[PDB]
Design a binder for these strands. Structure first.
Lengths: 143, 143
DNA sequence: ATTGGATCCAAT
DNA sequence: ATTGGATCCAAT
């Protein structure tokens, strides 16, 4: 099983479905389930408030944000349906293409958030989950 | 007795007489003996080499530099003969006025270097020497 | 100044 | 990513 580390608060917005794409400077052929881990970098409470304000405008004034954006832990997963270039992204998702300017744009569907979030240390790019933590995360989803 | 903290390598150049003035953003009415302490900031060996190259050009190809520029210690003293404004400095010392652009310029004479340099922790601006270290420094000069 | 918490930086 | 050495920053 494969994982991507993402800075908070974006990491929790991805597993909640509020943020629908993730931009990177590199391509991956990976498709299917992609676990999402928060990096260790803690966001300032104003950074959280400004991002929350922006996503209310993009999604609707009553979007339900997570109460906490925990760092350094495994949060849940998405289905990585495509890794588009910025050109393909503008072509295929005109309504949200403004939401990432990155060279490659990861299209995420079916987000799932873990109720119990396990501590983890991440790596660059797409990296392989340890079996013991992946086993626990799979059993946490099926509850 | 009063002391001024100066970054190396300039601090040792002052007690050797190679550097003849010290520039600051503030004025002092202090005149007479002024002890010179090196700050704790260690200079890079290239910073020392570049400064040494400059002072050879200003003073003569055979100027004798100290072999070491020790940090965080009491180095010796000068006689502070005047604290000139930058305007007075240009008027009175035209041959060396290029050697400081500071708002106030401390004119130093009679430099004396201690053979044994005692560890010290400095302060901003002109500060009062502890009696025990000042007693030892005075006895070190008279040897 | 000195100090150490905050931030920057590079690992090969 | 994470890590910690290097550098920046502010103390009232």
């Amino acid at each position: 099983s494969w994982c991507l580390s993402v800075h908070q608060p974006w990491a929790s917005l991805l597993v909640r479905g509020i943020k629908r794409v993730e931009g990177r400077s590199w391509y991956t052929p990976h498709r299917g389930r992609l676990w999402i881990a928060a990096t260790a970098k803690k966001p300032s409470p104003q950074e959280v408030s400004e991002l929350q304000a922006t996503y209310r405008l993009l999604r609707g004034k009553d979007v339900e944000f997570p109460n906490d954006y925990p760092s350094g832990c495994l949060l849940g997963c998405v289905d990585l349906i495509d890794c588009l270039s910025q050109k393909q992204f503008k072509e295929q998702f005109p309504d949200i293409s403004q939401e990432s300017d990155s060279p490659f744009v990861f299209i995420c569907k079916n987000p799932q958030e873990m109720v119990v979030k396990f501590p983890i240390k991440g790596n660059p790019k797409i990296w392989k989950l340890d079996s013991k933590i992946h086993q626990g995360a799979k059993k946490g989803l099926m509850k």
